[PDB]
């Protein structure tokens, strides 16, 4: 069997990966070797120990990658490098994996001899998993996006900070809330005051998230005015699709909200030709087994199309499907997907599965 090393398997993304792997009995088809950065299990920095592996699966992070990857490749190591971190995302010798969407891209690369595979951006992955069909028919001219991103994409400490923030907000008016006759204005007055207090914990986000939102994720890219996060819409969507020559416009705004691990996305999709709403749905629904077309119905939308419903599941519901007033060429869609699964660990688990078959 293939000898696979795992790095950063104790982190959050790594932990999700490990759990999914056990759930699917993925460990039965390979020889796993676990590494650690601790000096208190092999050393993640031992190049010779890593040289013996046929495959490397790391969820350790970019710095680790940028440090160890070159040295290892520098020894002549000819194995596979599977990364959850974005470091190599845009390398010519690397492919961004999302097999239910770009298997054909993955296969070809394997043919050519590509040995480095990287997991893609959560928002872009969740999008493609939702509306892959449209791209699979070359019907997407461009897409404007507005996201409602979860805290888990930022990190474990950010998720905890969101929760602490929610706690203090309620605690600020805990008794007033229990009194059915209390003034709502007095209440928000206090909640808002606590939110603005010096002691309101906002070190990780740099701003309040609970009870609010932050219309800015990642650093600003002077060139385009986009933030790195928004920039990935165009770059990554196209690299994944193998449309480096005929890029499809994907752009919009990325905003963080008080959700733990599911990203949501509102889309305005410019279709090449006009098609019946029902035909579009069928196209969307038939692309893969995880996407789920939610009927434009209130009750069902409230039960299915929410972070509350999808968290921790592999389902990728897409709904609110309908034509936009700008013309039959314009389609409206809203989707919800777990950031830690299809937006992180699941794409990684799947490529590994293929490499050890």
From Swiss-Prot:
The keyword Ligase does not apply. Phosphate binds at residues 89, 232. InterPro entries: Asp-semialdehyde_DH_CS, Asp_ADH_gamma-type, Asp_semialdehyde_DH, NAD(P)-bd_dom_sf, Semialdehyde_DH_NAD-bd, Semialdhyde_DH_dimer_dom. It comes from the Bacteria. Substrate binds at residues 149, 229, 256. SUPFAM superfamilies: Glyceraldehyde-3-phosphate dehydrogenase-like, C-terminal domain, NAD(P)-binding Rossmann-fold domains. Pathway: Amino-acid biosynthesis; L-lysine biosynthesis via DAP pathway; (S)-tetrahydrodipicolinate from L-aspartate: step 2/4; Amino-acid biosynthesis; L-methionine biosynthesis via de novo pathway; L-homoserine from L-aspartate: step 2/3; Amino-acid biosynthesis; L-threonine biosynthesis; L-threonine from L-aspartate: step 2/5. Its EC number is 1.2.1.11. The active site is at 122 (acyl-thioester intermediate), 263 (proton acceptor). The keyword Amino-acid biosynthesis applies. Changing residue 229 to D: No change in affinity for ASA and 82-fold decrease in activity. It catalyses: L-aspartate 4-semialdehyde + phosphate + NADP(+) = 4-phospho-L-aspartate + NADPH + H(+). One of its GO terms (molecular function) is NADP binding. NADP(+) binds at residues 10-13, 37-38, 60, 152, 339. It holds the Pfam family Semialdhyde_dh. Catalyzes the NADPH-dependent formation of L-aspartate-semialdehyde (L-ASA) by the reductive dephosphorylation of L-aspartyl-4-phosphate. Belongs to the aspartate-semialdehyde dehydrogenase family. Consists of two domains, an N-terminal nucleotide-binding domain and a C-terminal dimerization domain. Homodimer. This is Aspartate-semialdehyde dehydrogenase. The gene is asd.
């Amino acid at each position: 069997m293939k000898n696979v090393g795992f790095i950063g398997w104790r982190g959050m993304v790594g932990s999700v990966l490990m759990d999914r792997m056990s759930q699917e009995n993925d460990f039965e088809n390979l020889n796993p070797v676990f590494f650690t950065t601790s000096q208190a299990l092999k050393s993640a920095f031992d190049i010779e120990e890593l040289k013996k592996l046929d495959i490397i699966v790391t969820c350790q992070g970019g710095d680790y990658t940028n440090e160890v990857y070159p040295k290892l490749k520098a020894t002549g190591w000819d194995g596979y490098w599977v990364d959850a971190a974005s470091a190599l995302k845009m390398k010519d010798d690397a492919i961004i994996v999302l097999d239910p969407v770009n298997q054909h891209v993955i296969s070809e690369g394997l043919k050519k001899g590509i040995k480095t595979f990287v997991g893609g951006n959560c928002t872009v992955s969740l999008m493609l998993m939702a509306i892959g069909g449209l791209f699979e028919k070359d019907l997407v001219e461009w897409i404007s996006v507005a996201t409602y991103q979860a805290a888990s994409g930022a990190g474990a400490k950010n998720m905890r900070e969101l929760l602490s923030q929610m706690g203090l907000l309620e605690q600020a008016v805990s008794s007033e809330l229990k009194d059915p006759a209390s003034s709502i204005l007095d209440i928000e007055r206090k909640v808002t005051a606590k939110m603005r207090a010096d002691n309101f914990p906002t070190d990780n986000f740099g701003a309040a998230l609970g009870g609010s939102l932050i219309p800015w994720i990642d650093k600003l890219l002077p060139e385009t005015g986009q933030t790195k996060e928004e920039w990935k819409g165009y770059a990554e969507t196209n690299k994944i699709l193998g449309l480096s020559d005929n890029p499809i416009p994907v752009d919009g705004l990325c905003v963080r909200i008080g959700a733990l691990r599911c990203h949501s996305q509102a889309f305005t999709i410019k279709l090449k030709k006009d098609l019946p709403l029902e035909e579009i749905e069928q196209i969307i629904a038939s692309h893969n087994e995880w996407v789920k077309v939610i009927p434009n119905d209130k009750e069902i939308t409230l039960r299915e199309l929410t972070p509350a419903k999808v968290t921790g599941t592999l389902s990728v519901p897409v709904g609110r499907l309908r034509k936009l007033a700008m013309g039959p060429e314009y389609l409206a869609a809203f989707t919800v997907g777990d950031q830690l699964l299809w937006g992180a660990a699941e794409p990684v688990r799947r490529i590994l599965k293929q490499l050890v078959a």
